Amino acid sequence: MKGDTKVINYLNKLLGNELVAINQYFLHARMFKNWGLKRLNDVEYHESIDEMKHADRYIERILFLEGLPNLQDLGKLNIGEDVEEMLRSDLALELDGAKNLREAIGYADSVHDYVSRDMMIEILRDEEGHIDWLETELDLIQKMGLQNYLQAQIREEG
Amino acid sequence: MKGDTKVINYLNKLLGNELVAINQYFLHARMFKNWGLKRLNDVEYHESIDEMKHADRYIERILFLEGLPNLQDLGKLNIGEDVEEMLRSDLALELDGAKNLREAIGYADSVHDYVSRDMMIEILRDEEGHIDWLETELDLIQKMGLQNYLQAQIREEG
Amino acid sequence: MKGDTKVINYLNKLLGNELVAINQYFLHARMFKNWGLKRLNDVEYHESIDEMKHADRYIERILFLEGLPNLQDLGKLNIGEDVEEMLRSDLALELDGAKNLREAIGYADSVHDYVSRDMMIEILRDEEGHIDWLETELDLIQKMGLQNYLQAQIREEG
Amino acid sequence: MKGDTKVINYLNKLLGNELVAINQYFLHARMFKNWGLKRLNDVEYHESIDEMKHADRYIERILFLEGLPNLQDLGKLNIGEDVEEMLRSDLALELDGAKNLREAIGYADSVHDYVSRDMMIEILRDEEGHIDWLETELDLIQKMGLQNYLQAQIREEG
Amino acid sequence: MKGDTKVINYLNKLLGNELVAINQYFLHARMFKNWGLKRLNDVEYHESIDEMKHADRYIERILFLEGLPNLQDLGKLNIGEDVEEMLRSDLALELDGAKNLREAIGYADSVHDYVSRDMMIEILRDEEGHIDWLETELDLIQKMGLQNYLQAQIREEG
Amino acid sequence: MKGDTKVINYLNKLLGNELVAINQYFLHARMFKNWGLKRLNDVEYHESIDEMKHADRYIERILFLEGLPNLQDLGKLNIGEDVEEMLRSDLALELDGAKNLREAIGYADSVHDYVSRDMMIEILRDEEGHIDWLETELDLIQKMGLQNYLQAQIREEG
Amino acid sequence: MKGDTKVINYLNKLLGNELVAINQYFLHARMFKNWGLKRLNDVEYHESIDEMKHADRYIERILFLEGLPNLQDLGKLNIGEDVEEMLRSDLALELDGAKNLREAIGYADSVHDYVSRDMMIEILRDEEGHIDWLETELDLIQKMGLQNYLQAQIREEG
């Protein structure tokens, strides 16, 4: 079905954001894994899989709307050297994505693409949830201290 | 454990190949899906997941060997406009990867990194398997004709 | 138990026929498999296993009758280059075997070896069944056309 | 996929070895069976089926590598007249096959056909296992004496 | 089957390494157990059992190859007085074994003993895995501090 | 808890005996296995595991009693060249161990270490049981003759 | 049955020791419980129940031996004010009981009351086990520090 051109560009810009989040969350998960920090490996791997699934939703909507998914442009990953710096790059990436999402949702709404808009509010709701996890971890590091925080990651939660 | 520097570069060059195969196989799967070609969507999606799992094996080996995984450089995707052109870009990508793998396996062997070498022979064995599927499909297109070939893709196999 | 010498030679001549049918049906099954023609791989592999089991019945009867099984002389395989030519070499091999069987059954009967005779009528009944499958396929190729025939082989029957 | 010509010849030379092992192990199994030596019939029949499955692996690899399987040339079977002579022909055949395999594995490795090479190391591992069984039986015949050895074969093991 | 003499010596040298690892890992497990450090007792006991099973693989290969297993020469155990010193003697023993293994694998390969070679790459892969556990523990001790590290060992993981 | 010094030395002398029994019973089991003598492999492997478990009981008692387990001194193994010679070295080792145990039990009793004493009477009871098996086998070899005895070992008991 | 008078007095002296251990372990369990230290409540409550069951064994043996159980004399409880002081009073009580037990076991043995003697070696074995737990806890308090030790007691082990 023929979509609005500027909705298709927002969808590609947003898909482009997911492509860096997938790679950055996946490499952080495996870095935490290699350090023995199992709980951090499991939560970050899951966030990686969520972004994978978001990228898949945009690829499919762009194709239905008769656009072309751009999987060729990868933005700049910010890895970090320690646990706290790694969790802050992630919080910062999420905060930018949420910002681009707010803008795209408002545009899709103004051109009456209500289905693309609802897709994006669902993805925004998942991003606000990752933002909540990252903020609480970063605070817990300050409150219990890094050595206590690292000790809490070596066994997995349920 | 400290790995050989040139083994760590081969592992990153190879990881870099998987990153384009993941994106190119995933976008081809979803293009076939949008066209109604369900069987082709299912096989190409599975190949995408295999490359995902290969990329994960290299990320973990590079980290143990004390190197840094490069998830920042994405090579050039070659998408294609029709079914046959899409399957040929995939066969060509696989044929190059197999070529780089043969070279890396030989080097890892000469520096006695037998575990990195065996990991790569396993991945090479999976790639030869994707090469076999792609070659047979491309031949079947010539033998039964494209309209018959497209008709065979609209329901999924088991 | 001491068998009739000429019955033991018919049994070896017939065993010799099964040894080429086993190899020719097995190589055709794997050729069809490599071409993507799964239904043809499954039926020809099964015919190969039937001939295997026939060869086993003759080996055991020749040994009871105090003869020596000849597994050393392999006749000339006629492979074929395409689907239709491959199925016609098979039909032709079966038609010759059935001819040698008719002759051996009549001889075993005239020397009163009724058990060797009944063994051979059972094997003849299986060969007439392979002849029926091969003839119907060769006719279906003419009636629906080769491209339609090849399309029907890519998924397996039940 | 196009294979190295000399790898395809080693694969055919090896397939040719399996074709005599299949026939020689199968006829020995049925000879032991006719003599009442059930345990020897069961182990030799199983070795026959293993060679069958090895021959199938080579036929499929040669076809993928774009060669032609040679199922037309059967080498010379060495049957034997008694139990010990029969088991020694088998040990001798296995010892030759292992020798040709060592040579082919080294060549496949030097042309970087690591998947054909690994296939052959797996088959070599099964052949070393048959070599172990045959050597132990031949020693047990000397240690307990032939009449005791024959008595041990009349019921099947588990 | 008659093996290469120098392969049989590498196999005995390597068996000799496993005999000290078995005793050193077993005594460390029981020392950690006596100190209340249950998680460390369980992981080190399991490593002890792996070495037991490796020693068993070499004993059986040397016997098939017609050599004699040397279970009479025990090298020098390095026990350690505290947790960190104990884990570093283990890391150091593993690093030496891996070094002797790399050398033996290359020799077995050059004499074409591909089955003894593959046995050793499998054992090398298990040793690289123990090396990974030991390195991560030694780093976690530095990152969370010894009192936090000791507190994490008093209950067992799953 | 602080143990008596001479009790801790008896416990180490005894642990030292178990370390040769473990290695001598394990190598005899695998030699019988390689010869085809399965029943003898299973019983001797089990005796090896019992000694393993005895060595573990002494290591743990010495540690509680505040001593140091000596796993560094391995005595002289007496392997043997044939079945009967191998079983007699085992009977002789057991007979010595039982002798050292009788002496240690009496000493532990005189210093009132009743728990170390009871541990040792339990281990003595297991050793008298291995002595019974070895004596009966050695007699059965004389009564039925070696060729009959070897024939009885080729299948496993229950 | 009429017992030896001095065996009956040792049995009452020992029963008298269990009566203080029951009360001291039970009050310590409930004190740890009230402080939130659940793991310490569970282990000390179980030790209390073991002493209960020991007191029951002595009451029954004294009655069979025709003596009178003395449940009227309670010795002096040493409670303690903090966690470490409480665990040391317990270790000290156990160490005295073990001392009286060693003496009684030797006397019962010299008058040939082998059944009363074996009853007491079983109880001694349980007391050495409580001694092991108490010593390891007291060391863990020094090694991980009291605040880490108290944090580890707030959830129960399995």
Ligand code: HEM
């Ligand atoms: C173009 C970007 C990618 C897309 C669109 C994508 C999509 C997916 C999807 C849809 C799944 C299945 C999710 C589910 O469980 O329901 C998946 C799984 C997975 N992906 Fe990706 N992925 C991408 C990139 C990557 C990369 C770079 C890696 C990193 C190595 C990766 C690793 C994985 C892994 C390990 C799994 C789990 C596979 C399994 O065992 O099932 N993916 N991905």
Ligand code: HEM
């Ligand atoms: C002397 C000729 C041969 C005889 C007498 C023979 C006999 C047999 C028999 C009795 C079986 C078991 C049939 C059943 O399932 O009940 C069998 C299975 C089989 N044979 Fe043969 N065979 C012969 C040659 C071959 C050859 C040349 C190949 C080709 C590679 C082959 C491949 C197989 C395979 C793949 C199976 C199935 C094995 C399994 O997975 O169970 N056979 N054969």
Ligand code: HEM
């Ligand atoms: C010549 C060296 C040794 C060899 C070849 C050896 C081999 C084995 C094998 C094959 C097993 C069974 C593994 C399984 O669970 O699958 C085993 C178990 C065991 N070994 Fe050893 N072992 C050796 C020395 C020792 C020593 C010195 C000790 C230390 C006291 C020991 C203690 C044990 C224990 C406790 C088990 C578990 C037994 C059970 O409950 O099943 N082993 N060993």
Ligand SMILES: [Mn+2]
């Ligand atoms: Mn997202």
Ligand SMILES: [Mn+2]
């Ligand atoms: Mn997110």
Ligand SMILES: [Mn+2]
């Ligand atoms: Mn790949």
Ligand SMILES: [Mn+2]
């Ligand atoms: Mn691939």
Ligand SMILES: [Mn+2]
């Ligand atoms: Mn037939």
Ligand SMILES: [Mn+2]
């Ligand atoms: Mn037929």
Ligand SMILES: [Mn+2]
């Ligand atoms: Mn074979």
Ligand SMILES: [Mn+2]
């Ligand atoms: Mn074989």
Ligand SMILES: [Mn+2]
């Ligand atoms: Mn090892």
Ligand SMILES: [Mn+2]
């Ligand atoms: Mn190891």
Ligand SMILES: [Mn+2]
């Ligand atoms: Mn013992």
Ligand SMILES: [Mn+2]
């Ligand atoms: Mn014993």
Ligand SMILES: [Mn+2]
């Ligand atoms: Mn008590």
